[model samples]
Target chain A: SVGFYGKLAGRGDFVSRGLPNTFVEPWDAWLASGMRASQDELGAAWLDAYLTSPLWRFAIAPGLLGGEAVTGVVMPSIDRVGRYFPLTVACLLPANADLGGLVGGDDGWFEQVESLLLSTLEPEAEVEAFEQAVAQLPAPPCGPRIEQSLISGNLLRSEAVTPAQRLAALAQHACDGASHWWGRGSARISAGLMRYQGLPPAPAFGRFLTGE
Target chain B: HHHHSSGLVPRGSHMLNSVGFYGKLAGRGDFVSRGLPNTFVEPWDAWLASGMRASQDELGAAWLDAYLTSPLWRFAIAPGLLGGEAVTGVVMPSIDRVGRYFPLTVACLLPANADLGGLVGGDDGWFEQVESLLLSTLEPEAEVEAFEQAVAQLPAPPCGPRIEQSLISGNLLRSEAVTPAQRLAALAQHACDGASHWWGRGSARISAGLMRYQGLPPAPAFGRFLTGEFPGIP
Candidate 1:
């Protein structure tokens, strides 16, 4: 007689007696099913945005909003803002072109960012050590933080190394306030602030840790 | 580090018979006791108050007496000197309250406690905050009296016969509220039995030892030592 639950009690007290227990069962099932779909959709959207963006090129690329506004006049839409735009322009531009070319190479860009995230930037403790490490690193182009994304992958490198290992090592070091976002490849600045101020990068404990 | 005239002795007449042959916890030697203050009262007096001495209770007089004979009395009284003026009207959640709400608090504390803690916690922020709070808002004695008056006006709980020992202990401890360093030194005395502990109870044995080590006769009993009573008077 509780509306949506009326049929559940169709047999009167037989159902009424077990009603409270039954009440929690369907609500739980509904939530689990609903949550599964939402998680999948969020993961897919984030992954798609990361793969196709030219914001990953090195040479003095502006921020998404800022860079977009600067180059927006000529490249109007998705079709115009492709490989030739930010990425290729980075290959030609004077200030950032050299770094951009180095970053654009297959192993050059991602691996460098990964090394910084995993090895160099992560283990820092005090502010001075962090500042010194940052000063010594080459600035890369603005791009998606994929160490976090790749972190969840099943990929393995060499016989001993794994994507998870790389990501975790980087994550822990950064947590000690060793890294910053100004490094160009990762969100080192934001991540550094979080470590110093004792905050997490993303929402979930893992990502919030990396500022993903 | 301390020089032992004969390390850990009981020199005075009162010190030797404090427990009156209840037990020979401290040996029959003339060694110097550390400067730690030890309070000793007749075993019967404490037992009477604790209810542990009741005929119905299974604990024996010998057990109570032996306990009183050792450093137990010293440790018990140490906190009085440890927490001076703030001994009265101070309140922290009691063990009784913990029995009731501990499950919830334990659940909240589960992860952190599981991570492990010992003489100190992982963070100092809370300790600093509490110290600041204690310094700023601790009311004077008259205010505590008024607060006690207001508390007295409250209706009694269902178990009208109460055993709220925390409130009692807090009041006893808070009434004095000594400086934190004194509290720290007192705790150190409890732990290591050092020079700072000598004040509350007389440092008779200590002063006596100091005199002897300085190539002088035993000074009077601490009070008497000051007046030149003992042999080899320093």
Candidate 2:
């Protein structure tokens, strides 16, 4: 079973609408106060709140990856976000998949992440070429990349890695050399700035189980 | 997605969303002695086959069509909607065992680029004929020979895109007959006949392709299930 995971160590209170809804992150401090929203009916104050606050951003990049192309995409982020569509594409890619190459830099992990995100808006970007182009991506450092919680698919033994290191490791596409996510798993194919890790209940892998 | 477009209801003859004509047969006291009288659900293969067969009999179907004879288990088709918006289908109350409502019949919409403005709206009166053709496309279940035969005989409409558009709804439906011209007319009549609202055109110009593989629900809620994707996200 092929899967996709866009994890954001989010920082603020979350907002959601329904069980099968596209949740959102607060756009700014005003929203960080905390809230919730979902799909179905809008036309109330909550609609405005949800619209103003988009967290993630990813351009729908076409082209399959070695028969495992990135097909279904539903990223509902304000500054950043990503949710996967199961293996209608990507049947061969194993579950313990590589995240792919780094979109490295002195720039904050968040900034680097968005850099890769905005790049997809480019006219020419298939999976492989995209990874190659973004691999050379770099910039002057700025804001914090992420705020760490140090949980690595583990609850008992904390991973204890700093946000920067995780960004390095995760952004580095788990050291695949070339890339597996190829603009998918990294370069913050979702995002990695000093964002919160979302709520503990519906974390990255949790969302995966539900078909984000 | 329902466009400025609308949907329709199925006539009595087409009312068996899952049961089709057999729905009536199931209700009869003397139809058959095969099942546990009140508790047993009828087999869907009959409904699937009969609905399709009825549609074929009503169309530009002068030739003895081979579509009626094929085995029912071998087909799969991409479901579609009218506007290329979203794909939706109903649960076969009888055949589906899973608690989740996996689609038993998925409606295939018309080709997204199909030029209805000229081709169908033209004088060929091909609307009903072509409408009949869509049923022939499905209903046979698991066989392309029937679809191949119809597409070969009935010339493609002069249009924006050809009729060969494979179902790209990203989801596939069991290849079964949806509402054909005869039953389709039933669904269409539903739109205009309703008192609660007046959805124009009786959905007159809707393509049979949109209804392909889908069994139209009953008249009270007619055309309600024809839907599209998210409102904001394309």
Candidate 3:
């Protein structure tokens, strides 16, 4: 489940397009904003707006706890799941299964919960290591290191706490953790810092889920 | 991922997504009836296999191959241009050989490294082979060799860097057969650091072994299911 969850979180908003369709909405509108400009100019303006935009920043980060690895597979955010490809085939009775919904951080609850869990369990040093690794990841849009950081940090928190403390801490820290990167230019900072850390794959999601 | 870079329309065969091929079949009677190999059977088992295989495989190539060749891969790429990228065995209407569509398909079929220059101007007749390979999996070995050589000339991008490269456009092209030979060879080379055997020639064991190395689980259900009748098959 953790493995699945981590993937869901990591590859939530991977797009191979010009505009992130999810956050930007009607990508044409975003592109039309610079309608008169050349493709190069538009790309530049878009990158500026994208790197600076909050909603677009973690567009790749998951709304759910466990899902597929996020890559820049789509634009605006990870709309691949909700927009298409639901897991209803497996759910059999998908009444409320939301098989196709983006799994990791698409929800406020999962993101906040995962972040808090990481904060409580991980020691200052590991958090530092985790943070450093995160800061060194490549590309703000969908850096693997940032994904590793979020997952690693949360999983570490989950690991450090007793079961009793886990849920409470997860609940407590989730919002702040999300808002930290989500607020202002956290995505930029996160990606920058991840790049600096020479990030390795953050601890796998299984470590936190299975308490391994 | 479409093995033929340009992508081909599968005529008359049942179209099934990678997951559908496994999960639906597992839920039904057996794997053989579904006509899927043992490597894929259960959702969790597939993930476990993907994880295991992913560990040793190059991230870029793995993502590229799975996305381009798998049911999921073809579904993701092709749907934007065509309707219902997921309907199994749906044949696309006839494609025009000239203009943007034809060239685009050719570009997609070339190896990750090859550019428009090599694709349009290679002596091995790279363009023709690329088209056939993308549209059809059963190309002559000579054609495949020409296409591979053209691809070999491409420069490797930095590891995991999202460089612009040729990629197949749809999931409909995926089948029990029809994976592109070049990418498969590339993956094998990367898996064993260039020691693995080349893909193709209908070597089920080697194919299965590659799947295993990539973390595909054993397919007992598939073995049994392929032998039995599907229940309530739609």
lDDT of each: 0.22, 0.26, 0.23
Per-residue lDDT tens digits for candidate 3, residues B41-86, read: 2332454344434432434444333322321111111111111221
lDDT by residue (tens digit), candidate 2, A1-212: 22222221121223222112111211122122222212222224332223222223211111222222121122223211322111011112222332222123322433344444333322242434434433454322222222224356653232327775555445423223232211222211222222122221212222211111
Model 1 lDDT on a 0 to 1 scale:
0.22
Taking the tens digit of each residue's C-alpha lDDT, what string does model 1 give over A19-78? Answer: 233332432343234334434545544322222211121222322212211110000011
Question: Candidate 2, which CAPRI tier?
Answer: incorrect
| Model 1 misplacement above 4 A | A1-62, A65-212, B1-108, B118-123, B134-137, B140-234
What are the models' TM-scores? Answer: 0.17, 0.19, 0.20
Sort the candidates on TM-score, descending order: 3, 2, 1
Superposition error at B158 for model 2 (Å): 34
Residue by residue across B83-130, what tens digits does model 1's lDDT show? 221000111111111122000000001111111111121233333332
Interface Cα RMSD in Å, per prediction: 36.4, 21.3, 20.1
DockQ of every candidate = 0.01, 0.01, 0.01
What interface RMSD, in Å and to 1 decimal, does model 1 have?
36.4
Model 1: lDDT of residue B16? 15
TM-score of model 3 (CA atoms):
0.20
